[PDB]
């Protein structure tokens, strides 16, 4: 989601934008404010939750040595979805 | 030698020889030598009163059992926590006996050390450097002056109280058509990371209480 | 003094050894005195290292002598190992030796060729530099960086050799000796080369010791001394090679010595490939050797030791030492001083070219002006370590 | 106790000698310096600057220090005499490009934070 | 064990002397010197054709730092500041705040490609293989400011080359 | 023949912009490690000379300066002096990372933080050292940068 | 002042001053000092230009990273002008020529271009403005350079009533085309042709003096709307100057070139300004008011013509 300011400048996934009065945006004149449109926060939300059997499920981001360290995610609480700290993929215990 | 690939095999024979060779120099020149110590990695240390730079260095160079022909290295270690802040160090080689000894003195800003150039021609420039970077003055040096720093460097860099970024940064100015100097300004300051762990690392080296 | 001239190399010519401002005092045709100025490249390396971790400081030693890289790192590594009181695994010691000789090949090729480039001999510069290009790949295929590999570290090396490399180093070594014989076929017997480096810059045996010379300067005038034979460090006690010794003392012998050392490097590599042992490449002491990524991403202790060794480094026992190696140019060593913290307190770098340059005045007495070209070159002076 | 090894001068009376010896060394060299480097300041200006650096050290009292201050001066002069310095190095004592740094209190309180 | 390099004694026999006398007046060894050069004329030059050809490299090659993403697309970096704390030249600047969804992530991440020394330490210290160095090296710029890569530039490069960075890491992650 | 004033300028302007880039004679400043790569770039493998870029030229008949290595405060005045002696046109190319922002030695008292302070740089080549191939890319890139010059056209429109 | 322009630092190279200056025609002899002085303290600077980007390189060292910007524009266009002045805390116009082309005559560079710039600054709401007028401006003046100049001094005082128009006398400096004009152009390959330079009074000023004046004007809040002229501290006669010049330049002297493409030398109208007397305007505030002292031509003429001097000179007599 690239939502632009009324002044006409894009807003990054960090939210920074040179507001109306600031002179610092003059640099872009004749050039462009390079931004990356693959907003990280959006893409993860697209990925679906996963159903598991036991209270504890292990996440490694897939690939073992090529992923983040191994973390064990509690899932006793059912009012919320367990989340892997590193990659952010969610898990939830099923029918309970 | 022992069967432990992750440890350094001790060579005690060479260590014993240095201790035997220890008193050999402590007895011969007791007017100067203050302290002689041997480190566990087979390196002899001789502590000499600063006056005895020539008597001691000249001895080992020529004695019939030292024969330390070549001067390996010559520097100083700034240490602002001592009255004699600086600390010269001479590293000597001996091709005949195939061994190295280290000789150290102590001085300060205003107490020059006699040039050892007569003993070794090697220290012709190493003594310029020590003066250039640390400020210690060498008496009777044939030609003492800056060797490393830039001309008119109003300071002695390698002192521990000399900021890493200096005091003036250069730049070229069109108004005067020549390089100029100004007080140093950094686009990004040098971040000063604090690394010291708050837990005692080696109990062996523990300094006793005060 | 008749007419002192500030002969300057600031407008550097194609020699790539640094920038040298030389102040001389001629008497007509013949030179009579010299006074090199060497501050032109002093960057302050010996002062910055006091703010870095021993690990962070390692890349500096790579940029001291920028034609003998991996040899420099080995010099620093041995010093830290010695103070750490740990030994690299036997496989590591062979790899480091394997590249020490390869680096020594790199250094001499630069030394002999450029030393011949300065005297107008231009063809030998290329032929051998092509081999330097091939050798760069071995640097690049193990460490990923053509020159400043930083491959050698305290505790062994970083990554093990990739497959098909030793089987490819062998290919280089086998045909290499033909390259040198081509080199000698235009320098040794050539009369023009002889006229330039015979009876030039003769150094007396006693003086060489007094001024503080080392390497091909000492052994170029008869002195029998090579730290690879008297004070071996890694495995040199377990290989066979003959330290060439000259007798005349002039430049010619030093040129012969360097060419002979390269051949004595091949005789060693031939033994490193055949004797290369198996095992791990780094000390299996996690507190000094950060674990491989496999264990870091799986085990608790394996992670912490990968979280402190890359932010705080390893503590070193308080102390100081001087360690030296037979670097290609000459004796190279560091007077590292540790006060117990993960950052060195002091590090003096004994550049072999520092003493070999101060002694230029002595060697330059009573020689034509053009002979300083063949005198500076024969010493293999690189101002990266002269100034630091 | 104050037993201290001297460098050259055993007392201020001898030490002050080299200072006057030194001052003449500069005072007679400024004319050469201006012409040698083709600077663009009259011979008068250099000596006036020279006095300043000598003057700011009038407060000194230690015999050793004056020997040290003197020792540096010879090196500075020797480089100047031999033309080892360069036109740039000569003018670094005058601070041309540096704009007037304010020094009174109300000046400081209007420009920034430095006391 | 040593050996002598220049200790030959010229035998004073007439034939031998005539050879050294023959050598001088006929330049034979110099005629030989013209021989080796002639051979190299008829050899095949080792010159490659750039840019239509490239110099062989290796998977471990170090190039333009870049920031990676998981297969899902999420940023791998978690602002652990290991890379900053180890970059010898202090060419890395980092800031982080808890993102909207309360996940540790960066806000400001800058690499100074002029203070960088291209040492490879950053990719060694990353516990999640986020910051790496791609096989690209042709990124010379006409201005100094262009060579200051911030978070946006690094992410784009990572996305730009990711088709290759993984391929190299795949073949080489075992040695590490 | 026939052509407007604008057209004839472009073609005869296109010529010189081609001559001044097909024949570059670069002065070399071998100040540090990155000096070595400059030698490799001239070595047999790449043979920078194959593009007309000769190996050695008198600093007072150069065509482009390639600052390679660190720029010490002591050595800075010499560099500027050399720069002023270069006949126009003169293009300066910064090579490496210590000749761009002080590289490894950015915080060294005796290092000029980026040679651009002493002279105006045209092309910046990153990498310490920039692989001998990358440096060659910069030189090729410089020729294009020349190729995008329109002196006479601007002159005709004065 | 705007939040991002608050002063910060100690005024060095990388210190932030807060002066977002847009300089028009900065490529000229006068501009490069103004740019350099603005760059000295690190003030953000935008530099529109018309020539090749190559010709702007020498300005680059004068500014820190991201403080110097090289846009493009055209006098005949106002769309380009707006971009370069959209967020400038001040705008400086330094355009001008010593000769006329077939594209931009004297009026275009001295009337419309100074104006067109002024209006857009008003349209964009620029808070300040500076304009370089000529000391001898008068619509009844002989020199079309001056007559064209005299028109511009009016609109700029009208379109931007608060613009600080400045009217300096002849300027000299290292790259000046006045002291270098006499030494080389007048004499080289040609004996002096002075047409009885006995009545004229010339009062040139030093380039550095002008440069320091402009910056001080920007800082001052009360300088809004005023008008200044900068004149050396000592008046002189045309003939006395030329004769004295050859003493410093050590060229032979004998008391008493057409218009072509390229940059002409010794143009028809340029002569009138050499002979034209310097106006005496005691009522207009000058350099001394800006906290700037005039530097006598004796002190600084040495450096400019030192190069003319191939490989003990009484200073020129003054005229009250
Ligand atoms: C009209 C006379 C005016 C006086 C001129 C001086 C005297 C005459 C001397 C002329 C010498 C001949 C120069 C020919 C240049 C051709 C270059 C070439 O080979 O093309 C490849 C070049 C090379 O392009 P490149 O540089 O981008 O190549 C990139 C690298 N490679 C090829 C490896 C991928 O192609 C061009 O760029 C276009 C060349 C345009 C040349 C324009 C000048 C032509 C001469 C003027 C004639 C005008 C006629 C009137 C209109
Ligand atoms: C030129 C073509 C390339 C020649 C290749 C080399 C060659 O064929 O001759 C080399 C030959 C060997 O000479 P050398 O190594 O010194 O051993 C003999 C010691 N008397 O040296 C020779 O014998 C060559 C002799 C050539 C004749 C002398 C030159 C006469 C010149 C006028 C004709
Ligand atoms: N010595 C003097 O004349 C004195 C100074 N002044 C005024 O100071 C001002 C600046 O002085 P100075 O630097 O020596 O003047 P310059 O001759 O150097 O020209 C100043 C700028 O104007 C540019 N220029 C010329 N024509 C145009 C155009 N159509 N459109 C845009 N820009 C153009 C020039 O660029 P380009 O080169 O590409 O054309 C140049 O950058 C002058 O205008 C002058 O009236 C007033 C009193 C005395
Ligand atoms: S390669 Fe090394 S110097 Fe460069 S950014 Fe990475 S850690 Fe820093
Ligand atoms: S080391 Fe990796 S995960 Fe940690 S801050 Fe750096 S890029 Fe991010
Ligand atoms: S830029 Fe690269 S080659 Fe040059 S001095 Fe720095 S690290 Fe060495
Ligand atoms: Zn996960």
UniProtKB/Swiss-Prot annotation, chain B:
GO MF terms held by the record: NADH dehydrogenase (ubiquinone) activity; NADH dehydrogenase activity
Catalytic reactions of this protein: a ubiquinone + NADH + 5 H(+)(in) = a ubiquinol + NAD(+) + 4 H(+)(out)
GO BP of this protein: mitochondrial electron transport, NADH to ubiquinone; mitochondrial respiratory chain complex I assembly; reactive oxygen species metabolic process
Keyword list, A-Z: Electron transport, Membrane, Mitochondrion, Mitochondrion inner membrane, NAD, Oxidoreductase, Respiratory chain, Transit peptide, Translocase, Transport, Ubiquinone
Its membrane topology: Peripheral membrane protein
Subcellular location: Mitochondrion inner membrane
Keyword flag Electron transport: yes
Top-level taxon: Eukaryota
Chief localisation class: mitochondrion
Enzyme Commission (EC) number: 7.1.1.2
Single GO cellular component term: respiratory chain complex I
EC supergroup of this enzyme: translocase
Binding partners and assembly: Core subunit of respiratory chain NADH dehydrogenase (Complex I) which is composed of 45 different subunits. Interacts with NDUFAF3. Interacts with RAB5IF. Found in subcomplexes containing subunits NDUFS2, MT-ND1 and NDUFA13.
Function as written in the Swiss-Prot or TrEMBL entry: Core subunit of the mitochondrial membrane respiratory chain NADH dehydrogenase (Complex I) which catalyzes electron transfer from NADH through the respiratory chain, using ubiquinone as an electron acceptor. Essential for the catalytic activity and assembly of complex I.
Family: Belongs to the complex I 30 kDa subunit family.
UniProt-recorded name of the protein: NADH dehydrogenase [ubiquinone] iron-sulfur protein 3, mitochondrial
Organism: Bos taurus (Bovine)
Gene: NDUFS3
Full protein stretch here: 43 to 252 of 266
UniProtKB/Swiss-Prot annotation, chain C:
Binding site for [4Fe-4S] cluster: 251, 257, 272
Source organism superkingdom: Eukaryota
GO molecular function: 4 iron, 4 sulfur cluster binding; metal ion binding; NAD binding; NADH dehydrogenase (ubiquinone) activity; oxygen sensor activity; quinone binding
Biological processes, Gene Ontology terms: cellular response to oxygen levels; gliogenesis; mitochondrial electron transport, NADH to ubiquinone; mitochondrial respiratory chain complex I assembly; neural precursor cell proliferation; neurogenesis
Top class in the EC scheme: translocase
Compartments where found: Mitochondrion inner membrane
Cofactor section: [4Fe-4S] cluster
EC number, UniProt record: 7.1.1.2
Catalysed conversion reaction: a ubiquinone + NADH + 5 H(+)(in) = a ubiquinol + NAD(+) + 4 H(+)(out)
Bilayer topology: Peripheral membrane protein
GO cellular component terms listed in the entry, alphabetical order: mitochondrial inner membrane; mitochondrion; respiratory chain complex I
PTM comment: Dimethylation at Arg-43 by NDUFAF7 takes place after NDUFS2 assembles into the complex I, leading to stabilize the early intermediate complex.
Assembly and binders: Core subunit of respiratory chain NADH dehydrogenase (Complex I) which is composed of 45 different subunits. Component of the iron-sulfur (IP) fragment of the enzyme. Interacts with NDUFAF3. Interacts with NDUFAF7. Interacts with CERS2.
Homology family: Belongs to the complex I 49 kDa subunit family.
Descriptive protein name: NADH dehydrogenase [ubiquinone] iron-sulfur protein 2, mitochondrial
Designated gene of the protein: NDUFS2
Residue window of the full protein shown: 76 to 463 of 463
Swiss-Prot record, chain E:
GO molecular function: 4 iron, 4 sulfur cluster binding; metal ion binding; NADH dehydrogenase (ubiquinone) activity
Chief place where the protein resides: mitochondrion
Cofactor or coenzyme needed: [4Fe-4S] cluster
Binding site for [4Fe-4S] cluster 1: 77, 80, 83, 126
E.C. designation(s): 7.1.1.2
Keyword Mitochondrion on entry: yes
Tagged with keyword Translocase: yes
Name of this chain's protein: NADH dehydrogenase [ubiquinone] iron-sulfur protein 8, mitochondrial
Organism: Bos taurus
Residue numbers of the full-length protein present here: 37 to 212 of 212
Curated annotation (Swiss-Prot), chain F:
Catalytic reaction equation(s): a ubiquinone + NADH + 5 H(+)(in) = a ubiquinol + NAD(+) + 4 H(+)(out)
Membrane topology, from the record: Peripheral membrane protein
Binding annotation for [4Fe-4S] cluster: 33-34, 98, 128
Disulfide bonds: none
GO MF entries: 4 iron, 4 sulfur cluster binding; metal ion binding; NADH dehydrogenase (ubiquinone) activity; quinone binding
EC number assigned by the record: 7.1.1.2
Keyword Metal-binding: yes
Membrane-spanning ranges: none
UniProt keyword list: 4Fe-4S, Electron transport, Hydroxylation, Iron, Iron-sulfur, Membrane, Metal-binding, Mitochondrion, Mitochondrion inner membrane, NAD, Oxidoreductase, Respiratory chain, Transit peptide, Translocase, Transport, Ubiquinone
Compartment list: Mitochondrion inner membrane
Example of a GO cellular component annotation carried by this entry: mitochondrial inner membrane
GO biological process terms, semicolon-separated: aerobic respiration; electron transport coupled proton transport; mitochondrial electron transport, NADH to ubiquinone; mitochondrial respiratory chain complex I assembly
Residues with Hydroxyarginine modification: 56
Protein modification: Hydroxylated ar Arg-56 by NDUFAF5 early in the pathway of assembly of complex I, before the formation of the juncture between peripheral and membrane arms.
Cofactor note: Binds 1 [4Fe-4S] cluster.
Predominant cellular place of this UniProt entry's protein: mitochondrion
Cofactor entry: [4Fe-4S] cluster
Role noted for this protein: Core subunit of the mitochondrial membrane respiratory chain NADH dehydrogenase (Complex I) which catalyzes electron transfer from NADH through the respiratory chain, using ubiquinone as an electron acceptor. Essential for the catalytic activity of complex I.
Protein family: Belongs to the complex I 20 kDa subunit family.
Name of the gene: NDUFS7
């Amino acid at each position: 989601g690239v939502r632009t300011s009324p002044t006409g400048e894009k807003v990054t996934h960090t939210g920074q934008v040179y507001d109306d009065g600031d002179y610092r945006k003059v640099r872009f004149v004749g050039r462009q404010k390079e931004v990356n449109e693959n907003f990280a926060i959006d893409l993860i939300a697209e990925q679906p939750v996963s159903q598991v059997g036991s209270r504890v499920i292990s996440c490694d981001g897939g690939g073992g040595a090529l992923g983040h360290p191994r973390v064990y995610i509690n899932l006793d609480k059912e009012t919320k979805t367990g989340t892997c700290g590193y990659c952010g993929l969610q898990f939830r215990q099923q029918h309970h | 030698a022992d069967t432990r690939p992750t440890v350094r095999p001790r060579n005690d024979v060479a260590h014993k020889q240095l201790s035997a060779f220890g008193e050999y120099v402590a007895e011969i020149l007791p007017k100067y030598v203050q302290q002689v110590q041997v480190s566990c990695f087979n390196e002899l240390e001789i502590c000499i009163h600063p006056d005895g730079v020539i008597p001691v260095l000249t001895f080992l160079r020529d004695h019939s059992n030292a024969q330390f022909k070549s001067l390996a290295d010559l520097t100083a270690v700034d240490i602002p926590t001592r009255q004699n802040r600086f600390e010269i160090v001479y590293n000597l080689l001996s091709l005949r006996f195939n061994s190295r000894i280290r000789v150290k003195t102590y001085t300060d800003e205003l107490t020059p050390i006699e040039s050892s150039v007569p003993v070794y021609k090697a220290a012709n420039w190493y003594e310029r450097e020590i003066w250039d970077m640390f400020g210690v003055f060498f008496a009777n040096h044939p030609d003492l002056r800056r060797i490393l720093t830039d001309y008119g460097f109003e300071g002695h860099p390698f002192r521990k109280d000399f900021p890493l970024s200096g005091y003036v940064e250069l730049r070229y100015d069109d108004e005067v058509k020549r390089v100029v100097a100004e007080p140093v300004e950094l686009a990004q300051e040098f971040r000063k990371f604090d690394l010291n762990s708050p837990w005692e690392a080696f109990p062996a080296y523990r300094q006793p209480p005060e | 003094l008749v007419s002192n001239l500030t002969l300057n190399f600031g407008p550097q010519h194609p020699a790539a050894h640094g920038v040298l401002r030389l102040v001389m005092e001629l008497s007509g045709e013949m030179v009579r005195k010299c006074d090199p100025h060497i501050g032109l490249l002093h960057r302050g390396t010996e002062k910055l290292i006091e703010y870095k971790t021993y690990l962070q400081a390692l890349p500096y030693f790579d940029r001291l002598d920028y034609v003998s890289m991996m040899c420099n790192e080995q010099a620093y590594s041995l010093a830290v190992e010695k103070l750490l009181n740990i030994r690299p695994p036997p496989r590591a010691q062979w790899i480091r030796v394997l590249f020490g000789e390869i680096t020594r090949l790199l250094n001499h090729i630069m030394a002999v060729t450029t030393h011949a480039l300065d005297i107008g001999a231009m063809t030998p510069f290329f032929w051998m530099f092509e081999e330097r290009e091939k050798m760069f790949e071995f640097y690049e295929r193990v460490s990923g960086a053509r020159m400043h590999a930083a491959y050698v570290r305290p505790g062994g090396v970083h990554q093990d050799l990739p497959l098909g490399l030793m089987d490819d180093i062998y290919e280089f070594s086998k045909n290499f000796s033909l390259r040198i014989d081509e080199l000698e076929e235009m320098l040794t017997n050539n009369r023009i080369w002889r006229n330039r480096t015979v009876d030039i810059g003769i150094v007396t045996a006693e003086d060489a010791l007094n001024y503080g010379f080392s390497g091909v300067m000492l052994r170029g005038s008869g002195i029998q001394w090579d730290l690879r034979k008297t004070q071996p460090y890694d495995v040199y006690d377990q290989v066979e090679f003959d330290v060439p010794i000259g007798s005349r003392g002039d430049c010619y012998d030093r040129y012969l010595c360097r060419v002979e050392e390269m051949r004595q490097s091949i005789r060693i590599i031939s033994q490193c490939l055949n004797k290369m042992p198996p095992g791990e490449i780094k000390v299996d002491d996690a507190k000094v050797s950060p674990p491989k990524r496999a264990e870091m991403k799986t085990s608790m202790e394996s992670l912490i030791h990968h979280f402190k060794l890359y932010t705080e480094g390893y503590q070193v026992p308080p102390g100081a030492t001087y360690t030296a190696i037979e670097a290609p140019k000459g004796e190279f060593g560091v007077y590292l001083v540790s006060d117990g913290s993960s950052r060195p307190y002091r590090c003096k770098i004994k550049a072999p070219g520092f003493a070999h340059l101060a002694g230029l005045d002595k060697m330059s007495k009573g020689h034509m002006l053009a002979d300083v070209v063949a005198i500076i070159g024969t010493q293999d002076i690189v101002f990266g370590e002269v100034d630091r | 106790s104050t037993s201290v090894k001297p460098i050259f001068s055993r007392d201020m009376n001898e030490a002050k000698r080299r200072v006057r010896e030194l001052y003449r060394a500069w005072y007679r060299e400024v004319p050469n310096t201006v012409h040698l480097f083709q600077l663009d300041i009259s011979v008068k200006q250099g000596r006036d600057k020279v006095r300043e650096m000598f003057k700011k050290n009038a407060h000194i009292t230690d015999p050793r220090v004056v020997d040290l201050l003197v020792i540096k001066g010879k090196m500075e002069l020797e480089e100047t005499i031999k033309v080892w310095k360069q036109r740039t190095h000569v003018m670094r004592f005058f601070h041309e490009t540096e704009a007037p740094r304010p020094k009174d209190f109300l000046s400081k309180f209007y420009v920034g934070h430095d006391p | 064990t040593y050996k002598y390099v220049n200790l030959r004694e010229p035998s004073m026999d007439m034939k031998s002397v005539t050879d050294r006398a023959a050598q001088t007046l006929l330049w034979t060894e110099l005629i030989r010197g013209l021989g080796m050069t002639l051979s190299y004329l008829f050899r095949e030059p080792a010159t490659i054709n750039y840019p239509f050809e490239k110099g062989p490299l290796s998977p471990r090659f170090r190039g333009e730092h870049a920031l990676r993403r998981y297969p899902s697309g999420e940023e791998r970096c978690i602002a652990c500041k290991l890379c900053e704390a180890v970059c010898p030249a202090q060419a890395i600047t980092i800031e982080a705040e808890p993102r909207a969804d309360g996940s540790r992530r960066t806000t400001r991440y800058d690499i100074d490609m002029t203070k960088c020394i291209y040492c490879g330490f950053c990719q060694e210290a990353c516990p999640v293989d986020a910051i790496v160095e791609g096989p690209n090296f042709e990124f010379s710029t006409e201005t100094h400011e262009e060579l200051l890569y911030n978070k946006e530039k690094l992410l784009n490069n990572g996305d730009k080359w990711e088709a290759e960075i993984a391929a190299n890491i795949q073949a080489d992650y075992l040695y590490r | 023949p026939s052509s407007r004033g604008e057209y004839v300028v472009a073609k005869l302007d296109d010529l010189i912009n081609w001559a001044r880039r097909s024949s570059l004679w670069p002065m070399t400043f071998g100040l540090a490690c990155c000096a070595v790569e400059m030698m490799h770039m001239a070595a047999p493998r790449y043979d920078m000379d194959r593009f007309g870029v000769v190996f050695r030229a008198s600093p007072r008949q150069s065509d482009v300066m390639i600052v390679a290595g660190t720029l010490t405060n002591k050595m800075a005045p010499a560099l500027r002096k050399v720069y002023d002696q270069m006949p126009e046109p003169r293009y300066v190319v910064s090579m490496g990372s210590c000749a761009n922002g002080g590289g490894y030695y950015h915080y060294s008292y005796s290092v000029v933080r980026g040679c651009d302070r002493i002279v105006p740089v045209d092309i910046y080549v990153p990498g310490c050292p920039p692989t001998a191939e990358a440096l060659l890319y910069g030189i090729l890139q410089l020729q294009k940068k020349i190729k995008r010059e329109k002196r006479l056209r601007i002159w005709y429109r004065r | 002042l705007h939040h991002a322009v608050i002063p910060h630092g100690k005024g060095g190279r990388s210190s932030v001053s807060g002066i977002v200056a847009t300089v028009f025609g900065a490529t000229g002899f006068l501009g490069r000092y103004v740019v350099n002085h603005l760059g000295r303290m690190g003030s953000q600077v935008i530099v529109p230009h018309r020539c090749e980007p190559y010709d702007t390189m020498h300005l680059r060292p004068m500014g820190d990273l991201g403080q110097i910007i090289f846009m493009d524009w055209n006098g005949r266009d106002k769309d380009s002008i707006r971009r370069a002045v959209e967020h400038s805390s001040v705008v400086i116009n330094l355009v001008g020529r010593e000769w006329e082309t077939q594209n931009f005559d004297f009026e275009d560079v001295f009337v419309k271009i100074p104006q067109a710039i002024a209006q857009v600054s008003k349209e964009a709401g620029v808070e300040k403005f500076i304009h370089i007028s000529h000391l001898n401006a008068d619509i009844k003046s002989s020199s079309k350079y001056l007559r064209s100049k005299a028109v511009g001094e009016k609109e700029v005082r009208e379109t931007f009533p608060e613009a600080t128009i400045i009217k300096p006398a002849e300027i000299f400096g290292r790259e000046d085309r006045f002291l270098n004009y006499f030494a080389n152009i007048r004499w080289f390959g040609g004996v002096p042709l002075i047409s009885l330079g006995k009545k004229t009074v010339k009062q040139p000023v030093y380039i550095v003096d002008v440069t320091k004046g402009i910056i001080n004007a920007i800082k001052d809040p009360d300088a809004r709307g005023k008008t200044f002229a900068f004149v050396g501290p000592s008046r002189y006669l045309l003939f006395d100057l030329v004769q004295y010049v050859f003493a410093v330049a050590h060229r032979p002297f004998l008391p008493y070139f057409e218009i072509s493409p390229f940059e002409p030398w010794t143009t028809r109208d340029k002569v009138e300004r050499i002979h034209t007397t310097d106006k005496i305007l005691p009522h207009l505030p000058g350099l001394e008011d800006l906290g700037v002292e005039a530097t006598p031509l004796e002190l600084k003429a040495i450096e400019v013509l030192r190069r003319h001097r191939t490989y003990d000179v009484q200073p020129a007599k003054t005229i009250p």
